[PDB]
Amino acid sequence: DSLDQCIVNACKNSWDKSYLAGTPNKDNCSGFVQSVAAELGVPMPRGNANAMVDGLEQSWTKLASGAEAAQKAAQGFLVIAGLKGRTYGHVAVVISGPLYRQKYPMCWCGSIAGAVGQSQGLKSVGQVWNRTDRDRLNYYVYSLASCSLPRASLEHHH
Numbered sequence: 320d321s322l323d324q325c326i327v328n329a330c331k332n333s334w335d336k337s338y339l340a341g342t343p344n345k346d347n348c349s350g351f352v353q354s355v356a357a358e359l360g361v362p363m364p365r366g367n368a369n370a371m372v373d374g375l376e377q378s379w380t381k382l383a384s385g386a387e388a389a390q391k392a393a394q395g396f397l398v399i400a401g402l403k404g405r406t407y408g409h410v411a412v413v414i415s416g417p418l419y420r421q422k423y424p425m426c427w428c429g430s431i432a433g434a435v436g437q438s439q440g441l442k443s444v445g446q447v448w449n450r451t452d453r454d455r456l457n458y459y460v461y462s463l464a465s466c467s468l469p470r471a472s473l474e475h476h477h
Contacts, residue, residue: 323395323415325466327440329358330412330427334439344429345437351429352399352410359465361397368408372401372457379459385444388413388458389424395466399459400426400444402452409436411444413458419443423453 337343338350338357345351349368356363364374382388382398392398393415401410411428418424423445430436430447438447445453469475 395464
Protein backbone atom coordinates (compact mmCIF):
# COMPACT_ATOMS: atom_id res chain seq x y z
CA ASP A 320 0.00 0.00 0.00
CA SER A 321 0.95 3.64 -0.47
CA LEU A 322 2.22 5.59 2.52
CA ASP A 323 -1.10 7.44 2.69
CA GLN A 324 -3.41 4.48 2.19
CA CYS A 325 -4.92 4.83 5.67
CA ILE A 326 -6.43 8.19 4.71
CA VAL A 327 -8.22 6.85 1.65
CA ASN A 328 -9.21 3.75 3.66
CA ALA A 329 -10.81 5.91 6.37
CA CYS A 330 -12.64 7.92 3.69
CA LYS A 331 -13.99 4.76 2.03
CA ASN A 332 -15.00 3.31 5.41
CA SER A 333 -16.71 6.51 6.51
CA TRP A 334 -18.91 6.93 3.44
CA ASP A 335 -21.78 4.73 4.53
CA LYS A 336 -21.40 5.28 8.27
CA SER A 337 -23.67 7.71 10.09
CA TYR A 338 -21.69 9.82 12.55
CA LEU A 339 -24.93 11.63 13.26
CA ALA A 340 -27.03 8.54 13.93
CA GLY A 341 -29.89 8.42 11.43
CA THR A 342 -28.11 10.51 8.77
CA PRO A 343 -25.72 8.82 6.34
CA ASN A 344 -22.33 10.55 6.17
CA LYS A 345 -22.68 10.85 2.39
CA ASP A 346 -25.48 13.33 3.21
CA ASN A 347 -23.61 15.19 5.97
CA CYS A 348 -20.27 16.89 5.33
CA SER A 349 -19.46 17.39 9.03
CA GLY A 350 -20.37 13.80 9.91
CA PHE A 351 -18.23 12.41 7.12
CA VAL A 352 -15.15 14.31 8.32
CA GLN A 353 -15.86 13.35 11.94
CA SER A 354 -15.99 9.65 11.06
CA VAL A 355 -12.72 9.87 9.12
CA ALA A 356 -11.02 11.60 12.04
CA ALA A 357 -12.44 9.06 14.49
CA GLU A 358 -11.07 6.13 12.49
CA LEU A 359 -7.66 7.80 12.30
CA GLY A 360 -7.63 8.78 15.99
CA VAL A 361 -7.44 12.52 15.27
CA PRO A 362 -9.16 14.86 17.74
CA MET A 363 -11.62 17.12 15.95
CA PRO A 364 -13.66 20.18 16.91
CA ARG A 365 -17.34 19.32 17.40
CA GLY A 366 -20.41 20.70 15.68
CA ASN A 367 -21.59 21.69 12.23
CA ALA A 368 -19.24 22.61 9.39
CA ASN A 369 -19.09 26.27 10.44
CA ALA A 370 -18.27 25.34 14.05
CA MET A 371 -15.64 22.87 12.86
CA VAL A 372 -13.97 25.48 10.68
CA ASP A 373 -13.96 27.87 13.68
CA GLY A 374 -12.25 25.18 15.75
CA LEU A 375 -9.71 24.28 13.07
CA GLU A 376 -8.87 27.95 12.56
CA GLN A 377 -8.12 28.21 16.30
CA SER A 378 -6.00 25.09 16.72
CA TRP A 379 -4.66 23.58 13.49
CA THR A 380 -1.72 24.45 11.32
CA LYS A 381 -2.91 26.08 8.10
CA LEU A 382 -1.30 25.31 4.75
CA ALA A 383 -0.66 27.94 2.09
CA SER A 384 -2.12 26.19 -0.95
CA GLY A 385 -4.10 23.27 -2.30
CA ALA A 386 -0.84 21.94 -3.74
CA GLU A 387 0.68 21.86 -0.24
CA ALA A 388 -2.49 20.21 1.01
CA ALA A 389 -2.14 17.30 -1.45
CA GLN A 390 1.54 16.98 -0.59
CA LYS A 391 0.81 16.64 3.12
CA ALA A 392 -1.99 14.15 2.48
CA ALA A 393 0.48 12.10 0.42
CA GLN A 394 2.68 11.88 3.52
CA GLY A 395 -0.12 10.31 5.55
CA PHE A 396 -1.53 13.41 7.28
CA LEU A 397 -5.20 14.26 7.70
CA VAL A 398 -5.83 17.48 5.81
CA ILE A 399 -9.20 19.21 5.90
CA ALA A 400 -10.40 21.76 3.33
CA GLY A 401 -12.98 24.05 4.85
CA LEU A 402 -14.92 27.23 4.25
CA LYS A 403 -17.62 28.83 6.38
CA GLY A 404 -20.94 29.73 4.82
CA ARG A 405 -23.49 32.39 5.70
CA THR A 406 -25.97 29.60 6.39
CA TYR A 407 -23.97 26.36 6.14
CA GLY A 408 -20.28 25.77 5.63
CA HIS A 409 -18.58 22.82 3.98
CA VAL A 410 -15.65 20.59 4.92
CA ALA A 411 -13.82 17.87 2.96
CA VAL A 412 -10.88 15.51 3.37
CA VAL A 413 -8.01 16.24 0.97
CA ILE A 414 -6.31 13.21 -0.57
CA SER A 415 -3.22 12.75 -2.73
CA GLY A 416 -3.74 12.92 -6.48
CA PRO A 417 -3.41 15.18 -9.52
CA LEU A 418 -4.38 18.83 -9.05
CA TYR A 419 -7.39 19.98 -11.03
CA ARG A 420 -6.45 23.01 -13.17
CA GLN A 421 -2.96 22.71 -11.66
CA LYS A 422 -4.36 24.07 -8.39
CA TYR A 423 -7.18 22.16 -6.69
CA PRO A 424 -6.55 18.89 -4.84
CA MET A 425 -8.70 15.76 -4.91
CA CYS A 426 -11.04 15.17 -2.03
CA TRP A 427 -13.68 13.09 -0.30
CA CYS A 428 -16.79 14.67 1.19
CA GLY A 429 -20.46 14.18 1.89
CA SER A 430 -23.15 16.84 1.68
CA ILE A 431 -26.78 17.42 2.57
CA ALA A 432 -26.95 19.24 -0.79
CA GLY A 433 -26.67 15.85 -2.47
CA ALA A 434 -24.50 14.80 -5.42
CA VAL A 435 -23.23 18.34 -6.14
CA GLY A 436 -21.50 18.32 -2.75
CA GLN A 437 -20.38 14.67 -2.74
CA SER A 438 -17.03 13.24 -3.77
CA GLN A 439 -15.73 9.70 -3.40
CA GLY A 440 -12.23 10.81 -4.36
CA LEU A 441 -13.28 11.51 -7.95
CA LYS A 442 -13.82 15.27 -7.66
CA SER A 443 -11.38 17.97 -6.70
CA VAL A 444 -12.22 20.70 -4.21
CA GLY A 445 -12.39 22.99 -7.27
CA GLN A 446 -15.35 21.01 -8.62
CA VAL A 447 -17.19 20.54 -5.33
CA TRP A 448 -17.01 24.17 -4.25
CA ASN A 449 -18.42 27.03 -6.25
CA ARG A 450 -16.10 28.96 -8.58
CA THR A 451 -16.60 31.95 -6.26
CA ASP A 452 -15.39 29.88 -3.29
CA ARG A 453 -12.71 27.48 -4.53
CA ASP A 454 -9.97 30.12 -4.35
CA ARG A 455 -10.97 31.05 -0.78
CA LEU A 456 -10.63 27.59 0.79
CA ASN A 457 -8.68 27.03 3.99
CA TYR A 458 -6.50 23.94 4.33
CA TYR A 459 -5.80 22.61 7.83
CA VAL A 460 -3.40 19.80 8.68
CA TYR A 461 -3.06 17.72 11.83
CA SER A 462 0.23 17.87 13.75
CA LEU A 463 1.17 14.17 13.42
CA ALA A 464 0.85 11.75 10.50
CA SER A 465 -2.03 9.33 10.96
CA CYS A 466 -0.77 6.47 8.83
CA SER A 467 1.74 3.89 10.02
CA LEU A 468 4.78 2.33 8.43
CA PRO A 469 4.06 -0.10 5.59
CA ARG A 470 3.84 -3.78 6.55
CA ALA A 471 7.25 -5.23 7.40
CA SER A 472 6.53 -8.14 5.05
CA LEU A 473 6.32 -5.79 2.05
CA GLU A 474 8.86 -6.58 -0.66
CA HIS A 475 9.79 -3.48 -2.63
CA HIS A 476 12.52 -2.04 -4.86
CA HIS A 477 15.52 -0.27 -3.32
